[PDB]
Curated annotation (Swiss-Prot), chain A:
Belongs to the cathelicidin family. Large granules of neutrophils. BAC5 sequence consists almost exclusively of X-P-P-Y repeats. It comes from the Eukaryota. Exerts, in vitro, a potent antimicrobial activity. Probably due to an impairment of the function of the respiratory chain and of energy-dependent activities in the inner membrane of susceptible microorganisms. The lineage of its organism: Eukaryota, Metazoa, Chordata, Craniata, Vertebrata. It is found in: Secreted. This is Cathelicidin-2. Elastase is responsible for its maturation. It comes from Bos taurus (Bovine).
Length: 17, 123, 120, 114, 53, 209
RNA sequence: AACCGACUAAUGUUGAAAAAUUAGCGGAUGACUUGUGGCUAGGGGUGAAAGGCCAAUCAAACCUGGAGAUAGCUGGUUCU
RNA sequence: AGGUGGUCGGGUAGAGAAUACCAAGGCGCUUGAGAGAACUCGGGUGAAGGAACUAGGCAAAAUGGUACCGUAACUUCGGG
RNA sequence: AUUCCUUGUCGGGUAAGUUCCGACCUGCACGAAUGGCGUAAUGAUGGCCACGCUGUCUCCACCCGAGACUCAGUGAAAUU
RNA sequence: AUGUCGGCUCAUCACAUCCUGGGGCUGAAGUCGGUCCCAAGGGUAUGGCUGUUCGCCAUUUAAAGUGGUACGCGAGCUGGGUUUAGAACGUCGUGAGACAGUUCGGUCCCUAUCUGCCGUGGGCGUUGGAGAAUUGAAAGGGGCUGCUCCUAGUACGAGAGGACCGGAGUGGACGAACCUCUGGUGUUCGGGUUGUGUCGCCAGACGCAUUGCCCGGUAGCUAAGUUCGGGAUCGAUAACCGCUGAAAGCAUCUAAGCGGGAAGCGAGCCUUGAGAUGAGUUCUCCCUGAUACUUUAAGUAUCCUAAAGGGUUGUCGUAGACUACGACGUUGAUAGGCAGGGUGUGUAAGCGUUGUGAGGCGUUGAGCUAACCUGUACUAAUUGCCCGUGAGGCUUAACC
């Protein structure tokens, strides 16, 4: 089954440090 | 140019004071009812002891609109407020027995001949 | 689309354009020949040449009209005392645009604009 | 266009009564109920007039059976059989659309009364 | 957003194939013999053979 | 089919006696004159070429002027060709007039539509706008997606996008003729005709009749 | 209103700006706000408590030294 | 296009250091010129309808002053 | 702000209500100063409803400006 | 470092077909259905609830297809749900904390090089050059459908009900062109009005306050307005139905042969279209000079010529980002102005009169009036410069 992934960091560009 | 959510006065003595178009009937994706067009309406506000009650879903024929009607000479007749006549949802025959305010000759025809007979004026 | 429309915006508000052209007309009446950018010259004709026509008929009404459009009493006097009389017979074309190359600073297409039949 | 002008002026009504905004007119409108052709009278106030030769129109506002009704007529249309000015109104404007928001006393117009 | 490969000199050159300059329309004044932008006054103030400035 | 080459004069109305207004475009057909007859033997198809109006002699090239001289017509504003299908016989110089459409109920009119310049997908193709508020960032009249990821990894040909709108040959079909005026060389055609006033219009008997 | 603040949105996000602008928004005689000068210092301070803040840095500041810590990992390792 | 303590504060209107227009005084913001496409930004108006939009009336629109009249449940009797 | 099953069930509101309000109690897995239950007033607090209002939307149209485009001068950027 | 749910925008394909078309069987009387076969041309709900997809519900529709496309689409949007950091409830844990439970809150970057795509140019080519008009190989667009009436209350049916076939009309949705009308807009037109500043003052104006606000409104653009479209027809077919007909004395639509037969297929309609390098066709126009030189060519150089026409420049456009395209360039209405008109606004100013005055009235439908209409050389459109040459190779055939 589809397991909801964590593909991206929680803080998004343009702030992504 | 009536659509879902449009409120209309009741030009009848059916007991509705105000109705709301639920559906423009006729065709798929049909946007608008004009004068002569039948609409499904919900009674939003009704008189205390009448034929129709608040929440009664039924049909109605639009008889007056602010957008009005073009006539073949290029004329246009516009009313100040939008009105309609509640019709039996099966028979499409007027619930009331009296029409209030003018109507247009666009209703002239076999379908709404009773409306036209009862109306005080036909412009 | 601008189909059939008239009047250049000249990268300005309306109030600015109105101010600018009122000024520019006053300058042209005063000096009888003015160097401007070519598009401003072409617009100026639609402002000045009507003032000159007004000035052909001398009336308190017309002077006040000219004053309203120029807000300059020296200009209004020159209009009604000199320029009207001069152009009395002439049926339009009170001004003449002569293209005059480019401005140094911005290579803007420039033009002289002058009154016709300057005594000078 | 001279062509369009010639074409339009051939169709124009010869003698139309002078009416103005604020006038109370009675338009006799030709109605045809099947075979029979009658005149029906539209009586109200001229609130707007479009002067455009053959393309001229005028809007008349009446209050009928408790309902505001406006009708823009095409002056030079055959359907408009006649126009009678009942009362000449004194207004200060070309278009009396302000009357849409007035009623009764507020909606009264002053008589011109030469 | 940005190239994945630096552009060659060839292709750069190909883009600038339309970048060439065109000359001004000139004419010579009858009276002053001075070259001028056609339709424009000369530097000495002639236009079509008459001193206009 | 044979047709005329008019100029759109403008629109107007025609009041009928029964109080119907009829929106009409007025096409002025100045006498069309045959300037060349193409035959199957010479050209591999049967057509007439016609000119209309007048061109300033000064504005006529020598190449143009010889072609007209050969017909013995005076130069007109252009040249337009009408295929013949009926084995109809015309000679050069032969005039075509509005009276061609004396029996014709409906015509098909063709002009160049007015030009709207560079127009976006919203006006050009009736694309829906995106939300005006509710978060939309700089993408109100944006066209949306233009494709479908890795497969096919490219934009398909004929995809509706912004671009030049108008200024294109357009033919309206089955426009009724309200009136032929032979005196004034007018056709009154019900409804809209492509392009602005002053534009050349080709009028032809309706193909779907 | 000033002043202090920072609830919403839009812009901006290679900014005008390493946190703003515009329109609105809260407090506005008080547990107010502000200037100057003092004091508290790193397992330490300070915290109407958010692991907040302690020089655009913080679940242990910054600098220098031990120091080339260590790196069962990754990279790279040059002529025939 | 940010931040930076204190002092001074004219006229008309106005409760006012708000706001509008001005004075004294100071400026036009160190790229200009054209054009009048899409689209973006910031605004103005809008037929008919009126929240059907949307996660959500977000955003807009709307209300907006003074005097008087009048004002419900509820209440800790102050309120509301 | 706790309930899994679950959009429990009943009632209200709507043409239609997984939300809301009232109520029921088989409380998966409330509960009495980690307070229980109320509670006027207050809140840029959460949910829901109504009127008004509207370009939020049907479904966009037009217009005013700043960019975009063209000319002249200056002249970056990530990337490769 | 390949952004992950749902929505929005925009799609494209399959066909296992939801509708519409064609059929066979039916436990098909008709009206409806069922089921299967052909068919992918077009079409194929809006709302209430929920982050939802879904689902349920309301009300539609001819129908509300099923799927693929990184569960299509975040360098296109959103960010409600998931996905951090705050906080709280239940629950678990002595605890720090945890939960695939819940709850409130919580920053979505990128100026597009290349491919691609939509547009729009420049270059060269197409064999002498030039101006036009075209043919159509090829491609694209379009392709939906309701209801009513007639046929006919006929056929069918005990009745109730109620057709096929054929014809006519009028819609929905979609598309297009257009602006005569109905309207929107109209900061370039006219007016009213608040505050204030100024023009010495009055009067009259002007600036500024969102175009200060308010009311109208020309041209243009435009939809809600107007008008038109989808086809018929031909040809070939699908399933299917045959005719004649053996193999197989019969039978058999098939093996020979000949038919019918779909919204589908090729044409037919609209648009593009000879870079169709396979570069087509037709009409018309223009250029019929010298020399030297060579390693003699489709040679080179000099001189003389500079055509048809193309450009640049100019006035411009219902054409336009720039271009391009089109008009005009004095042998001229191209633009501006000007005249007259129209249109809009709504009775200017000044003066007179009336009134104590605000104000009223007359002069006066006045004054002003953009993008409009008709005119008009008044102003501005300068044959100046470039570019483009000098009868166009060779072979072969046939003609002279």
């Amino acid at each position: 089954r589809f397991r909801p992934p964590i593909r991206r960091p929680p803080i998004r560009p343009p702030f992504y440090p | 140019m009536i659509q879902m959510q449009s409120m209309l006065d009741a030009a009848d003595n059916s007991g509705a004071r105000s109705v709301m178009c639920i559906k423009v009937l006729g065709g798929s994706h049909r946007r608008y009812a004009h004068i002569g067009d039948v609409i499904k309406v919900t009674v939003k506000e009704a008189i205390p002891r009448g034929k129709v009650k608040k929440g009664d879903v039924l049909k109605a024929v639009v008889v007056r609109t602010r957008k009005g009607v073009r006539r073949p000479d290029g004329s246009v007749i516009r009313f100040d407020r939008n009105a309609c006549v509640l019709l039996n949802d099966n028979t499409e025959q007027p619930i009331g027995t009296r029409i209030f305010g003018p109507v247009t000759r666009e209703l002239r025809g076999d379908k709404f001949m009773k409306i036209v007979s009862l109306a005080p004026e036909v412009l | 689309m601008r189909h059939r429309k008239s009047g250049r915006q000249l990268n300005r508000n309306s109030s600015h354009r109105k101010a600018m052209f009122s000024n520019m007309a006053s300058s042209l009446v005063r000096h009888e020949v003015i160097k401007t950018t070519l598009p401003k010259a072409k617009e100026l004709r639609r402002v000045v040449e009507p003032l000159i026509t007004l000035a052909k008929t001398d009336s308190v009404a017309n002077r006040r009209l000219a004053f309203a459009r120029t807000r300059d009493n020296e200009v209004v006097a020159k209009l009604f005392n000199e320029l009207g009389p001069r152009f009395a017979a002439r049926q339009g074309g009170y001004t003449r645009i002569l293209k005059a190359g480019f401005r140094a600073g911005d290579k803007a297409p420039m033009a002289y604009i002058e009154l016709v039949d300057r005594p000078a | 266009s001279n062509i369009i002008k010639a074409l339009e002026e051939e169709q124009m009504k010869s003698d139309l009564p002078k009416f103005a905004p604020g006038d109370t007119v009675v338009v006799q409108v030709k109605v045809k109920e099947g075979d029979r052709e009658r005149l029906q009278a539209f009586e109200g106030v001229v609130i707007a007039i479009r002067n455009r030769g053959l393309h001229s129109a005028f809007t008349v506002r009446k209050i009928s059976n408790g309902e505001g009704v406006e009708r823009t007529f095409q002056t030079h249309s055959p359907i408009v059989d006649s126009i009678e000015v009942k009362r000449r109104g004194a207004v200060r404007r070309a278009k009396l659309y302000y009357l849409r928001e007035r009623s009764g006393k507020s909606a009264r117009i002053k008589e011109k009364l030469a | 957003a940005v190239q994945k490969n630096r552009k060659t000199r060839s292709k750069r050159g190909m883009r600038r194939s339309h970048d060439a300059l065109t000359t001004a329309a000139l004419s010579v004044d009858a009276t002053s013999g001075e070259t001028h932008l056609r339709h424009n006054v000369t530097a000495e103030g002639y236009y079509r053979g008459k001193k206009v400035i | 089919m044979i047709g005329l080459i008019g100029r759109k004069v403008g629109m107007t109305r025609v009041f009928t006696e029964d109080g119907v207004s009829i929106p009409v475009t007025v096409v002025e057909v100045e006498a069309n004159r045959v300037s060349q007859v193409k035959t199957l033997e010479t050209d591999g198809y049967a057509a007439i070429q016609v000119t209309a109006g007048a061109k300033k002699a000064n504005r006529v090239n020598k190449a143009e002027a010889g072609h007209f001289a050969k017909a013995g017509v005076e130069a007109g504003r252009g040249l337009w060709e009408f295929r013949l299908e009926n084995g109809e016989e015309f000679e050069v110089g032969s005039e075509l007039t509005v009276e061609l459409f004396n029996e014709t109920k409906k015509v098909d009119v063709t002009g160049t539509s007015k030009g709207k310049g560079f127009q976006g997908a919203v006006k050009r193709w009736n694309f829906r706008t995106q939300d005006m508020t509710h978060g939309n960032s700089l993408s109100h009249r944006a066209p949306g997606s233009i494709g479908q990821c890795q497969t096919p990894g490219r934009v398909f040909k004929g995809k509706k996008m912004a671009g030049h709108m108008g200024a294109e040959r357009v033919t309206t079909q089955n426009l009724e003729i309200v009136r032929v005026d032979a005196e004034r060389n007018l056709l009154l055609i019900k409804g809209a005709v492509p392009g602005a006033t002053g534009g050349n219009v080709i009028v032809k008997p309706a193909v779907k009749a």
